[PDB]
């Protein structure tokens, strides 16, 4: 059973280490996945071997039932999920994945609010979107309020992966109401609470 930490954080320039313990094998391998879609990329295989076009800042090690990936001089593009691979008596085993978080200065989000499109309204559904642009850190709270009533269990959030150039996140909260529900209220607002905001920011519109 390969055990690896869920997260690891480092400032650009720092040297970071990710350890993977477990398995009854002679070799460990490290595979990087940038987005949940992305096919994995071998960074290190057979404990220390490095495939071509992988930077020399990636190092591999093995000490007993432990394997270590070393990134010397972390960069903003090193943000990704790192999977460790090995062998067990049960076959080939993988770790759960370690997420590398590149540290940066705080950044407040840029809040935007979108009313439902007139075409969508014809279909009997209303989707209201609240965009949170380019912020850091990931922890941000979006509160939806319709005619000053806190909405609950009718919104879903989606976060982009941390940027490879400027290490910032972007979140989108979509509130789904029926066309009847959207037609009986006046004001719609999303209230954002982020570390980079001195006080919660509210963006809103008025119709339907």
Partner 1 sequence: AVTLDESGGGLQTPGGALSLVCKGSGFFSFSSYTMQWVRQAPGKGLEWVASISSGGGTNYGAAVKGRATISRDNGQSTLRLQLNNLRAEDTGTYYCAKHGVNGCDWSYSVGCVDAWGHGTEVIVSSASTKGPSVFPLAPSGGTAALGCLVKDYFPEPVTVSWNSGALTSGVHTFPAVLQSSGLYSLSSVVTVPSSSLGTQTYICNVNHKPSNTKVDKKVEPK
Partner 2 sequence: RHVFIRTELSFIKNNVPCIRDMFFIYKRELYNICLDDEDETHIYVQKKVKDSWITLNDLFKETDLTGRPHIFAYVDVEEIIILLCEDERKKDMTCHRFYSNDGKEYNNAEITISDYILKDKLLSSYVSLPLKIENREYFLICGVSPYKFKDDNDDILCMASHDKGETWGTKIVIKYDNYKLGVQYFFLRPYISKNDLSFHFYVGDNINNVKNVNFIECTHEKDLEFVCSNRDFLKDNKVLQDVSTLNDEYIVSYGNDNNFAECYIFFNNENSILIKPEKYGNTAAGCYGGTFVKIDENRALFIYSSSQGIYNIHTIYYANY
Q: Which residues contact partner 2 (rule: CB under 8 A)?
A: 24-27, 64, 87, 89
Segment near partner 1 (CB under 8 A); pick from 10-18, 143-151, 166-174, 193-201: 166-174
Query: Are the CB atoms for 14 and 57 separated by under 8 Å?
Result: no
Backbone phi, psi, residue 191, to 5°: -110, 115
Backbone phi, psi, residue 68, to 5°: -125, 125
Residue selected from 5, 12, 34, 42 as contacting partner 1 according to rule CB under 8 A: 42
153 binds, among partner 1, partner 2, none (CB under 5 to 8 A by kind): none
User: Considering the complex, what minimum distance in angstroms separates the CB of residue 96 from partner 2?
Assistant: 22
For residues 122 and 179, give the distance between their C-alpha atoms in angstroms, rounded to a whole number.
8
Backbone phi, psi, residue 76, to 5°: -60, -30
66 binds, among partner 1, partner 2, none (CB under 5 to 8 A by kind): none
64 binds, among partner 1, partner 2, none (CB under 5 to 8 A by kind): partner 2
Using DSSP's 3-state secondary structure scheme, residue 50 falls into coil
- Eight-state DSSP code of residue 122: H
User: Considering the complex, what minimum distance in angstroms separates the CB of residue 14 from partner 1?
Assistant: 26
28 is a site residue for partner 1 (CB under 8 A)? yes
Backbone phi, psi, residue 27, to 5°: -135, 140
86 is a site residue for partner 1 (CB under 8 A)? yes
52 is a site residue for partner 1 (CB under 8 A)? yes
Enter the tokens of residue 23.
């398995």
Query: Are the CB atoms for 20 and 4 separated by under 8 Å?
Result: yes
The number of helices, as runs of H, and strands, as runs of E, in the chain is 2, 16
**Residues that bind partner 1 in the complex, under the rule CB under 8 A:** 23, 25-29, 31, 35-37, 39-42, 45-47, 49, 51-52, 67, 83-87, 90-97, 110, 112-117, 119-120, 123, 127, 129, 131, 133, 156, 158-160, 170, 172, 174, 205
């Amino acid at each position: 059973a390969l055990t690896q930490p869920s997260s690891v954080s480092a400032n650009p320039g720092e040297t970071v280490k990710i350890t993977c313990s477990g398995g009854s094998s002679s070799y460990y391998g490290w595979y990087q996945q940038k987005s949940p879609g992305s096919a994995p990329v071998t960074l290190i295989y057979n404990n220390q071997k490095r495939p071509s076009d992988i930077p020399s800042r990636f190092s591999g090690s093995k000490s007993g039932s432990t394997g270590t990936l070393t990134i010397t001089g972390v960069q903003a593009e090193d943000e990704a999920v790192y999977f460790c691979g090995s062998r067990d008596n049960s076959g080939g085993i993988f770790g759960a994945g370690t997420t590398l978080t590149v540290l940066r200065t705080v950044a407040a989000p840029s809040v935007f609010i979108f009313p439902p499109s007139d075409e969508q309204l014809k279909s009997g559904t209303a989707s209201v979107v609240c965009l949170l642009n380019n912020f850091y850190p990931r922890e941000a709270k979006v509160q939806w309020k319709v005619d000053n009533a806190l909405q609950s269990g009718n919104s879903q959030e989606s976060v982009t992966e941390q940027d490879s150039k400027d290490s910032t996140y972007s979140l989108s909260s979509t509130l789904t109401l029926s066309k009847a529900d959207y037609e009986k209220h006046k004001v719609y607002a999303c209230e954002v609470t982020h570390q980079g905001l001195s006080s919660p920011v509210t963006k809103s519109f008025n119709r339907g």
